[PDB]
JSON list of C-alpha atoms in Angstrom, two decimals:
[
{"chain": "A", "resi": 1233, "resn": "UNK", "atom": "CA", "xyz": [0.00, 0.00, 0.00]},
{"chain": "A", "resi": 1234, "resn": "UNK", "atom": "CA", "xyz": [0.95, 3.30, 0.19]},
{"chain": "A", "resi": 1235, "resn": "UNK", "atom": "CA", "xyz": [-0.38, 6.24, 1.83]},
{"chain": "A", "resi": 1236, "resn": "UNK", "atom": "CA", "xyz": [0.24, 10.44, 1.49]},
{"chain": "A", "resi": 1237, "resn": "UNK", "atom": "CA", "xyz": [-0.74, 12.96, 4.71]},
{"chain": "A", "resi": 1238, "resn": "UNK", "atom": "CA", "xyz": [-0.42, 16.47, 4.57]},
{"chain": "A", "resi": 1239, "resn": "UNK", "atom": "CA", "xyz": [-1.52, 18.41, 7.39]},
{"chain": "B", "resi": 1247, "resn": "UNK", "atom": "CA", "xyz": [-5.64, 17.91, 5.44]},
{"chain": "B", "resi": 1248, "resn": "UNK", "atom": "CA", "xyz": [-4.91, 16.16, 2.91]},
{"chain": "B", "resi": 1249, "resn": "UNK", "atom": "CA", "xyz": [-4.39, 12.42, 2.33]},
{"chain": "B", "resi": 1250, "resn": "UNK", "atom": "CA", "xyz": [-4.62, 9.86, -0.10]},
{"chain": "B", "resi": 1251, "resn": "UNK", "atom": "CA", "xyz": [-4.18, 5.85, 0.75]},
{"chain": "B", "resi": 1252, "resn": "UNK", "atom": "CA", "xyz": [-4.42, 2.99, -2.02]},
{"chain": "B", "resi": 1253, "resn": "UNK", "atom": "CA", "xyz": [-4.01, -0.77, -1.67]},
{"chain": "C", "resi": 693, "resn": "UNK", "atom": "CA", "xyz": [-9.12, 0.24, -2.84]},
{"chain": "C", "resi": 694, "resn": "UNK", "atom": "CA", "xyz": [-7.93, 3.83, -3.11]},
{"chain": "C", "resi": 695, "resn": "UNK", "atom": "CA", "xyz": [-9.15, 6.95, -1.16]},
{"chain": "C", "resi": 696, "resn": "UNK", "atom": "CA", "xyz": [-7.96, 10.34, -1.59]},
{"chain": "C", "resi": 697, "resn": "UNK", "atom": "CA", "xyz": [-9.18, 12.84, 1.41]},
{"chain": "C", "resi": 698, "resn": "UNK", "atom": "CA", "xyz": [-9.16, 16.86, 1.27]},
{"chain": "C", "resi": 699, "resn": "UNK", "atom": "CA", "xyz": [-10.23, 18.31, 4.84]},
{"chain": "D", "resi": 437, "resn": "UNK", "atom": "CA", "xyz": [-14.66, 18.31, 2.44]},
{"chain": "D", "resi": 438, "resn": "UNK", "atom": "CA", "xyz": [-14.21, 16.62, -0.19]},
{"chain": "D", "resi": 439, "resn": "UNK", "atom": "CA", "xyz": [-13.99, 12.40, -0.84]},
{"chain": "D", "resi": 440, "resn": "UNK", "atom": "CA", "xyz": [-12.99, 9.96, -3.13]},
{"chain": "D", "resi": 441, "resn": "UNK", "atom": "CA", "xyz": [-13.44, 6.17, -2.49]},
{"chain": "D", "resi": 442, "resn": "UNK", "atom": "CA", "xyz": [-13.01, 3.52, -4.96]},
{"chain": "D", "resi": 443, "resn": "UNK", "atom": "CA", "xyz": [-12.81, -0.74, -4.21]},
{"chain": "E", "resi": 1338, "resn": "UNK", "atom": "CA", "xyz": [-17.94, 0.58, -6.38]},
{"chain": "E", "resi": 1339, "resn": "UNK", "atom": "CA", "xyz": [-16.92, 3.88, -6.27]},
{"chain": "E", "resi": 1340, "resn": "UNK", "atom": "CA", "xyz": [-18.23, 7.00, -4.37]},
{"chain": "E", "resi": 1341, "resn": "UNK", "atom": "CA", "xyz": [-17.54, 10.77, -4.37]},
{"chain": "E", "resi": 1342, "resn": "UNK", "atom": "CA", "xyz": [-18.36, 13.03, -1.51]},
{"chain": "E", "resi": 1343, "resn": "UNK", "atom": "CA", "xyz": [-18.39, 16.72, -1.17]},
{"chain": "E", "resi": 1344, "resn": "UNK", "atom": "CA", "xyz": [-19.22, 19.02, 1.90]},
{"chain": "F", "resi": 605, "resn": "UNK", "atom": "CA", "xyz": [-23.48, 15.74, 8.17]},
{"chain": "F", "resi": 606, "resn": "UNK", "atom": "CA", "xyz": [-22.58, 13.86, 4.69]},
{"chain": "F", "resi": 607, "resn": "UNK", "atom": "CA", "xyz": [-22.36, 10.44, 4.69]},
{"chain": "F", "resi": 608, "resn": "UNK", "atom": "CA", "xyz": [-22.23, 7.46, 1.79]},
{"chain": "F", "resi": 609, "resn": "UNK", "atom": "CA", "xyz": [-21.84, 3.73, 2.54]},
{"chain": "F", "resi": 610, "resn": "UNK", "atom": "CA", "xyz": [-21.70, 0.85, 0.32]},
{"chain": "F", "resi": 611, "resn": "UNK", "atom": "CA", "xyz": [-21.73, -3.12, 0.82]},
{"chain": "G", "resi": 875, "resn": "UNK", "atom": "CA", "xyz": [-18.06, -2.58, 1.91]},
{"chain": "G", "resi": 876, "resn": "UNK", "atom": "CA", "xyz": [-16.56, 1.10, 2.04]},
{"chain": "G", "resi": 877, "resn": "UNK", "atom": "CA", "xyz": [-17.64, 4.59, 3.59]},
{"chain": "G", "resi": 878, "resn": "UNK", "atom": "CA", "xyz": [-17.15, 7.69, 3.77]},
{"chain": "G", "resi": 879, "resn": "UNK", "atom": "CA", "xyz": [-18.46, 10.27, 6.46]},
{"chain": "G", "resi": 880, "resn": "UNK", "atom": "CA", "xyz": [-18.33, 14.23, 6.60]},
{"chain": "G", "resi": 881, "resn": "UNK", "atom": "CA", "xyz": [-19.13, 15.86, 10.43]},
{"chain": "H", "resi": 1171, "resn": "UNK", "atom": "CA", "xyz": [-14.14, 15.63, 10.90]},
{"chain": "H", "resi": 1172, "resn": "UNK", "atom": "CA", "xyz": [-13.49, 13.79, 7.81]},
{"chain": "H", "resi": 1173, "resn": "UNK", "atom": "CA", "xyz": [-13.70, 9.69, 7.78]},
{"chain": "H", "resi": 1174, "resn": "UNK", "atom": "CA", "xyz": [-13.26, 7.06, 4.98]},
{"chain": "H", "resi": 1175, "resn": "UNK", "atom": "CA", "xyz": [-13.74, 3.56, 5.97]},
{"chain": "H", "resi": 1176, "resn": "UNK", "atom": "CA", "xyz": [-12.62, 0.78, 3.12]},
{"chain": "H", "resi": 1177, "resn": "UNK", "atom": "CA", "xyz": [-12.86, -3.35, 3.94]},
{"chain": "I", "resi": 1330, "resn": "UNK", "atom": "CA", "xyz": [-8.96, -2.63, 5.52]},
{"chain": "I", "resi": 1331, "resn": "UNK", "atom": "CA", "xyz": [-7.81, 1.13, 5.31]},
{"chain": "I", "resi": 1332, "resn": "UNK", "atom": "CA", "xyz": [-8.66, 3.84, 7.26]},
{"chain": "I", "resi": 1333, "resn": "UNK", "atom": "CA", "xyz": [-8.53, 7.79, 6.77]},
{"chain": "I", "resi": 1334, "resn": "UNK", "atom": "CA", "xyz": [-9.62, 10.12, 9.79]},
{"chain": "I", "resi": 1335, "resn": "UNK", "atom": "CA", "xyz": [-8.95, 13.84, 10.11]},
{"chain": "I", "resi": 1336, "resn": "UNK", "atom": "CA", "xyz": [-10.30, 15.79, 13.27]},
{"chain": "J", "resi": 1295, "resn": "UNK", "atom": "CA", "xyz": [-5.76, 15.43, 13.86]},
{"chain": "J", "resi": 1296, "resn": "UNK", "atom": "CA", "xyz": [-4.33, 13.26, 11.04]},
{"chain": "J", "resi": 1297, "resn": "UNK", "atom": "CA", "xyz": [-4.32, 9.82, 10.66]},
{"chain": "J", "resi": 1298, "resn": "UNK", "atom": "CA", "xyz": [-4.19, 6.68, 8.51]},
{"chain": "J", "resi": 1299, "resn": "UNK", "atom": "CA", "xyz": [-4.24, 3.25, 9.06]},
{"chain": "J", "resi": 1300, "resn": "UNK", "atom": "CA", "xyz": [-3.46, 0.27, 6.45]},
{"chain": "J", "resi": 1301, "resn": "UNK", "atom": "CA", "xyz": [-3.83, -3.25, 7.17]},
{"chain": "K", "resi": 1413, "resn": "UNK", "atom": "CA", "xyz": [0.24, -2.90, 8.32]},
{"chain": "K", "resi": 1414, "resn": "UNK", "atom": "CA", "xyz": [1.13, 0.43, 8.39]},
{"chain": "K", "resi": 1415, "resn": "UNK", "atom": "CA", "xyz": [-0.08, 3.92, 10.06]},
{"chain": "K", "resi": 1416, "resn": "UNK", "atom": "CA", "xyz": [0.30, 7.63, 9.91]},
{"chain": "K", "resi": 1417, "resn": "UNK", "atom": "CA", "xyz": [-0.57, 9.93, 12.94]},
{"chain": "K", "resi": 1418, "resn": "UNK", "atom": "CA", "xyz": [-0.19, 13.90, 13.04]},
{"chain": "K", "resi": 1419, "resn": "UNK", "atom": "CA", "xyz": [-1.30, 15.51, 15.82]}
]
């Protein structure tokens, strides 16, 4: 999987 | 917030 | 699956 | 908000 | 399926 | 309130 | 079975 | 508050 | 399973 | 709060 | 499995 998170 | 998540 | 998320 | 959700 | 959400 | 679900 | 839920 | 929920 | 949750 | 989970 | 947290 992969997975992105930008807060 | 931004995210994104794929298997 | 895949999921993209804007908050 | 905004969503995206695919299987 | 797929689904798209906005708020 | 927003809400989709799917079986 | 997916979902997606905006508060 | 934002949720997605994929199984 | 995957899971996105912003608060 | 940010968060994503992947199993 | 894998996880992302920001708080």
């Amino acid at each position: 999987f992969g997975a992105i998170l930008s807060s």
